[PDB]
Design a protein around this ligand. Structure first.
Ligand code: PLP
Ligand code: PLP
Lengths: 396, 396
């Protein structure tokens, strides 16, 4: 019965790793990764999570099942992290949150929930977007469309072209927004554009679906959430998928939440129960480890202070590197003006190199980027910074 | 958009917990649970897993993403646990295994994989079966049918009636077998009946789907697998979902694997890639914690020896309790002959009480069982054993 089965197509991101872990050139550099790396080239366990894990090892007495929605604490801290302390939404009991296996698990859960309990048929995802967004949505049965976003020429957010592509979006359609650090491009709407996008959404009838995967990496934990909070203020409904994989360095523990907000308590509840049933037919209940670690940190003044600083360092390292990158080029040749790399947020951004320029980089020079010219800035160190720009300038 | 949403129906198993955690009667007893409990009424963390977790805390240097299939070690030990050491299947490179979030996550993953890459439309699950089996299958789009199993009158496995219901099963149909400790009833096919069921499956063209959730609880780790191994010997294809939640007491860490076997290397591989793509659109990659704990134990002679003993104790406690149960009744009144409870395997079995007898138990006497009359034997202790049978005999 499996003899007819077709090879699944490689992922070139997940498929890119291999040739790196096969190349030999000494200079070898991997800027196609999706995780953060410190100045020494490693993806360390935060000190704060190591402390929370010792606590757990000592205080855990059972590994019995969590509820289907996970750890209550975890759910609350998330809501507070996302919407804020004295939020009208939290006080009105308008939000229910489900602990989920990774930001990805949250997306799929919203997907299966939306797919089977509502009349949603389409989801619009920004033009360049995290490639896996589409696949998560298709597998639920939903159709994915694309709205315009990135100005190929100006390396900016085309606000008009974006809106112009969102008028073809009808009422009960789900629009997907990246809360901060746009995954492929790093270009984020300003606060005025989020307020504008919020208003259009209210009039037009769209159902917002926020993907928060890097809270804390553009400007901070609170600032990074103003857009999401601009919508939360005028919308009666919205869904939000967050991940704690990149901001807690908890990648393989699968920590993320899927938050659902309705018009009032009775509704978020009724709707939440169907969400529970979706989870229940998927993985049954969430993995306690990484999430126990996050509830513990966030609810301990001591540990939380340390984590904030660890987040801040990470964020500051990337900012140190975007700047050092746009400079070393200016010194080592650099035809073009890469000044745009600066103030593009998060670990990524499009270099703007052609697909053929990337190949040449990876083949002669041994620098590994995603064919889209997307580079992970956190994979740059002061040490490899120089050969890196020298091999880029050697291709334009 | 969520105002039309319908209340999801309660789970009465997951919905049964509540009224227990609300009742007041001192004598209060919960035999409707799904987890194991020791003689003191607790679900402890094994000593072996506590040791493996200290190891991890000390030796882990990163929490970076696992592959989509998880931890290789974990995959190998599983294969060896399931098929055996010098297995033709392992040596021929005929099996690929994916670490998954719980036995439930494995089921869904097989489900989405089967749903989208094969011409499977139906799945047959034993008559009384783990209720969540159906929901996992429906959500993939597959249809669930039911084959006969349990002799209401004899408290036995109706071998004929079973087979008689499996002739309506056509060629590319998936038949689901519980490898050991049938979830609701505890009745397991003997080795001759597994060999017979294997042969029928080969001639008729069915695709076996084994659900192993209690390996080690009926007779042992190896014996519990002879059925599965009887099929593995004649089948060119078969799928197996295993869970490590009940045998490692790792309930909330979501540890389970989804094993896929094809006719040969090239095929299991091609097919495996599509399975990877299913996982990839679901949760992206598996939680490392509970699975790291299992690879570490299983690959350490010291720790594995301790675990085996802990498994053996659990298994022996349940056997001590089935026997003590069928006896205390014989002493305290007992109309009927419950001698059938003895040598019914695992933590469960049907008491054979009518749905109205269960209600009366739970309402007057404060004993909590699932309406199907299913009782968890591991929730019985020598201490509560006496009031328990006294309140049962008070209802017949
Ligand atoms: C990383 C990422 C996710 C997936 O998160 P996991 O937490 O690893 O599942 C989802 N969305 C975006 C935009 C991401 O960058
Ligand atoms: C417990 C159980 C499962 C689910 O296992 P988890 O590992 O908790 O997902 C699946 N199948 C059967 C028969 C079970 O008893």
């Amino acid at each position: 019965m499996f003899e007819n089965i077709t090879a699944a197509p490689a992922d070139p991101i997940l498929g890119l790793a291999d040739l790196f872990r096969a190349d030999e050139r000494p200079g070898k550099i991997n800027l196609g990764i999706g995780v953060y790396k410190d100045e020494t080239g490693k993806t360390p366990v935060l000190t704060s999570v190591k402390k929370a894990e010792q606590y757990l090892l000592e205080n855990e007495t059972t590994k019995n099942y969590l509820g289907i929605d996970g750890i209550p604490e975890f759910g609350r801290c998330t809501q507070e992290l996302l919407f804020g302390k004295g939020s009208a939404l939290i006080n009105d009991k308008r939000a229910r949150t489900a602990q989920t296996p990774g930001g990805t698990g949250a997306l799929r859960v919203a997907a299966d929930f939306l797919a089977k309990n509502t009349s949603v048929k389409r989801v619009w995802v920004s033009n360049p977007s995290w490639p896996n967004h589409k696949s998560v949505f298709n597998s639920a049965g939903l159709e994915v469309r694309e709205y315009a976003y990135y100005d190929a020429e100006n390396h900016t957010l085309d606000f008009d072209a974006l809106i112009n592509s969102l008028n073809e979006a009808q009422a009960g359609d789900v629009v997907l927004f990246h809360g901060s650090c746009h995954n492929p491009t790093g270009i984020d709407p300003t606060l005025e554009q989020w307020q504008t996008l919020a208003q259009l959404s209210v009039e037009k009838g769209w159902l917002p679906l926020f993907d928060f995967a890097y809270q804390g990496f553009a400007r901070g934990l609170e600032e990074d959430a103003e857009g999401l909070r601009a919508f939360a203020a005028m919308h009666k409904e919205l869904i939000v998928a967050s991940s704690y994989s990149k901001n807690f360095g908890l990648y393989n523990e699968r920590v993320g939440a899927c938050t659902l907000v309705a018009a009032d308590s009775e509704t978020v509840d009724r709707a939440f129960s169907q969400m529970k049933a979706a989870i229940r037919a998927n993985y049954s209940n969430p993995p306690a480890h990484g999430a126990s670690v996050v509830a513990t940190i966030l609810s301990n003044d001591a540990l939380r202070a340390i984590w904030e600083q660890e987040l801040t360092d990470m964020r500051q390292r990337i900012q140190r590197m975007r700047q050092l990158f746009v400079n070393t080029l200016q010194e080592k040749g650099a035809n073009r003006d890469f000044s745009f790399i600066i103030k593009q947020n998060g670990m990524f951004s499009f270099s703007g190199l052609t697909k053929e320029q990337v190949l040449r980089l990876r083949e002669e020079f041994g620098v590994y980027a995603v064919a889209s010219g997307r580079v992970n800035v956190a994979g740059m160190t002061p040490d490899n910074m120089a050969p890196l720009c020298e091999a880029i300038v050697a291709v334009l």
